[PDB]
Amino acid sequence: CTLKSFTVEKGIYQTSNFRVQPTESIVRFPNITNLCPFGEVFNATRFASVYAWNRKRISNCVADYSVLYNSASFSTFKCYGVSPTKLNDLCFTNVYADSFVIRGDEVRQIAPGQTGKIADYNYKLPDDFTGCVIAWNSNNLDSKVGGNYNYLYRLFRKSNLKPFERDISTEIYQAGSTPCNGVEGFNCYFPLQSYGFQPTNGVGYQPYRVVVLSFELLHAPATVCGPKKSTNLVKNKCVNFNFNGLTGTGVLTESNKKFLPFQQFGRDIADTTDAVRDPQTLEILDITPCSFGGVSVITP
């Protein structure tokens, strides 16, 4: 087949390669059971303005994102740095939660590297943002027949805003050289402005509820991820392994190298993962590539 002939002369020829196949699959996760509170992140009622955006740091739990997949109440659901269906088994160090209220038409400028008034002036999303954003209509609650004016945003300021900032000061804007000093003259303007939400307003003018979730993957040990079940370990054979999202194929073996208590895994040569600390027994396991080689056939 390789030499494209029905007759072959005497000699030695290289045909193909082989690899030892894994026999089992093992998954390891830390034994943690408490559910961390997504309840008062989406079902909560007390939320803040555009420039007063709420900050919640959530950790030390396990999470099930299946509520996010199947809840039809969520109007738009667009993830970027990861595929939405894959969050069920990836494992993350920490999760950042932001909540704030935006008029419906300004949803498109809440995007990685997007330009706009809210983007450049209130809340800008970084270019390499590896998280996801959710939003849904809320005209039924955040609107009154007489008009609700409690929500404000800032739109006059000199320079662009860095990705993770918050400002609440409302100093008078010096649009001109006149030092009006707290009085809104013709050359000055008050930095804030309020959205006039009424139920008679158009759908684009209707208020919307937006929550932003961001993830980061560092070398630090992970703390929050899905309910994927763990299993017993197998040693001295070719086997597929999963360690807090780190996946591959190899042979697990005891190690004599000593890890520092703050270290987790090794990259000794050419950034290759050779050792992984066991989350349960704290013992360091060596990774060895599964056996492989070429095939040569000798014929007369």
Partner 1 sequence: AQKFNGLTVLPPLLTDEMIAQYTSALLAGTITSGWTFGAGAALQIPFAM
Partner 2 sequence: PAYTNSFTRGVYYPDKVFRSSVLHSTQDLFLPFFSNVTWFHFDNPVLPFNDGVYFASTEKSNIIRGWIFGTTLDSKTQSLLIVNNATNVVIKVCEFQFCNDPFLMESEFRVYSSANNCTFEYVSQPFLMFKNLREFVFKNIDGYFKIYSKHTPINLVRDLPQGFSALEPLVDLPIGINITRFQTLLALHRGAAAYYVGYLQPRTFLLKYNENGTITDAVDCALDPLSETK
Partner 3 sequence: VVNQNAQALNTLVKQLSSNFGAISSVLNDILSRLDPPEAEVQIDRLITGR
Ligand X SMILES: *[C@@H]1O[C@H](CO)[C@@H](O)[C@H](O)[C@H]1NC(C)=O
Q: Which residues bind partner 1 (CB under 8 A)?
A: 269-270, 272, 289, 293-294
The pairs formed by 254-259 with CB atoms below 8 angstroms and a separation of 24 or more are: 254/283, 254/285, 254/286, 255/283, 255/284, 255/285, 255/286, 257/284, 258/284, 259/284
> Does 82 sit near partner 3 (CB under 8 A)?
yes
Binding mask 158-187 for ligand X (x = CB under 6 A): ------------------------------
Among 42, 65, 77, 80, binds ligand X (CB under 6 A): 42
Which whole-number Å values give the CA distances from 3 to 15, 17, 106, 233, in the listed order? 9, 16, 64, 45
The CB-of-30 to ligand X minimum distance in angstroms stands at 6
Pick between residue 37 and residue 289 the one whose CB is nearest to partner 1: 289
Choice from 270, 282, 292, 294 touching partner 3 (CB under 8 A):
270
Minimum separation from the CB atom of position 265 to partner 3 (A): 13
In the region spanning residues 141 to 180, those forming contacts with partner 2, defined by CB under 8 A, are 164
Q: By CB under 8 A, which span of 21-29, 148-156, 231-239, 266-274 interacts with partner 2?
A: 266-274
Residue closer to partner 1 by CB (options 1, 270) is 270
Could you tell me how many residues make up the chain? 300
Among 4, 10, 168, 262, binds partner 2 (CB under 8 A): 262
Q: Distance (Å, rounded) from C-alpha 6 to C-alpha 29?
A: 55
Measured in degrees and rounded to the nearest 5, phi and psi for residue 188 equal -130, 160
Q: Which is nearer to ligand X, 161 or 252 (CB)?
A: 161
Residue 251, amino acid: V
Q: Would you count residue 264 as binding partner 2 (CB under 8 A)?
A: yes
Report if residue 221 touches ligand X, rule: CB under 6 A: no
Task: State which residue, 37 or 245, has the beta carbon closest to partner 3.
Answer: 245
Q: Which tokens sit at 191?
A: 């930095």
Question: Considering CB distances under 5 to 8 angstroms, the limit depending on partner class, which of partner 3, ligand X, partner 2, none binds residue 164?
Answer: partner 2
- Residues 175 and 189: their CA atoms lie apart, in Å, by 7
Which residue, 123 or 195, has its beta carbon nearer to partner 2?
123
Phi, psi of 232 (to 5 degrees): -70, 155
Residue 249 tokens read as 């194929």
DSSP string, 153-214: EE---SSPPPSS------PPB--SS---SS---TT-B-SEEE--B-TTS-TTTSEEEEEEEE
- Token pair, residue 124, equals 């800008």
Nearer to partner 2 among residue 15 and residue 263 (C-beta):
263
Report the nearest approach of partner 1 to the CB of residue 18 (Å): 13
The answer for residues whose C-beta is within 8 angstroms of residue 220's C-beta and 6 or more apart is 93
Contact residues toward ligand X (CB under 6 A) are: 30-31, 42-43, 71, 280
